[PDB]
Design a protein around this ligand. Structure first.
Ligand SMILES: O=[N+]([O-])c1ccc2nn[nH]c2c1
Length: 263
């Protein structure tokens, strides 16, 4: 009857560990289910990576139009955008778009290099008040999702709070803020997850993640019509159901949250 026990049932059926955080900016109303447990980020870190790059652009230490050249030797598996541009390279802006909207692994690695590595991303997160999220490794090894491993993890509550600070706070310039929002709104990988359980008229930006040990994640900023945005972070790991069913778990979280929020 309570959202918390609805999620426990759903978590039971998934065979894994489910983490949910909701941060409604209209009210400050938070919700958490395992909100302070660590979960593997997998590709959800790429939303933070893009923010860190934009911070440099605001600082004048990076330009969105700067062209990065690379080769076949740089290509990491699942690189559907960067694999097409070994011959002409891609700009920093194009790499951010590829990392966010397609989870392009090579794009993420090239942006990490422009930033100074996973330690540089973690330091950026510390500088903006996130004392929990950490990136340690590169693509594709950060997707190992080994239980009990703190490397490359966040908590649902910390991720939602960090998304609020970056997408709605003062950390980024209004131009960079809107650009990060625009990239998330254009995401191509999340049609079967949170989006599949949200009202059709909701405006959604999201970043998915997928990894070993049955790991399937989705984090989002959501604008209901004529309403302040809501930040949602859903992490599922150690799952024992197949890929489509893991997607369905995330969609059902969105359905249960909206229902619980409207009644
Ligand atoms: O995902 N949500 O947290 C969420 C909550 C309430 C809503 N009303 N419309 N869409 C919503 C999404």
């Amino acid at each position: 009857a309570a959202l918390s026990e609805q999620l426990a049932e759903l978590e039971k059926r998934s065979g894994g560990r489910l983490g949910v955080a909701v941060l409604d900016t209209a009210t400050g109303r938070r919700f958490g289910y395992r909100g302070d447990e660590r979960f593997p980020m997998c590709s959800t870190f790429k939303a933070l990576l893009a923010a860190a790059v934009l911070a440099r652009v605001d600082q004048g230490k990076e330009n969105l139009d700067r062209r990065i050249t690379y080769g076949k030797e740089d290509l990491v598996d699942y690189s559907p955008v960067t694999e097409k541009h070994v011959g002409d390279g891609m700009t920093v802006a194009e790499l951010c778009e590829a990392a966010i909207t397609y989870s392009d692994n090579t794009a993420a690695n090239l942006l990490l290099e422009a930033l100074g590595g996973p330690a540089a991303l973690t330091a950026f997160l510390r500088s903006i008040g996130d004392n929990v999220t950490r990136l340690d490794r590169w693509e594709p090894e950060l997707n190992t999702a080994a239980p009990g491993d703190p490397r490359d993890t966040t908590t649902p509550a910390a991720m939602a709070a960090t998304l609020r600070t970056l997408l709605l706070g003062d950390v980024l310039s209004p131009a960079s803020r809107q650009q990060l929002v625009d990239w998330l709104i254009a995401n191509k990988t999340g049609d079967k997850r949170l989006r599949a359980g949200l009202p059709a008229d909701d405006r959604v930006g999201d970043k998915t993640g997928t990894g070993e040990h049955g790991t399937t994640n989705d984090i989002a900023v959501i604008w209901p019509p004529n309403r302040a945005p809501i930040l949602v972070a859903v992490y599922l790991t150690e799952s024992q159901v197949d890929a489509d069913a893991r997607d369905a778990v995330i969609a059902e979280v969105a359905r249960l949250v909206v229902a619980a929020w409207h009644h």
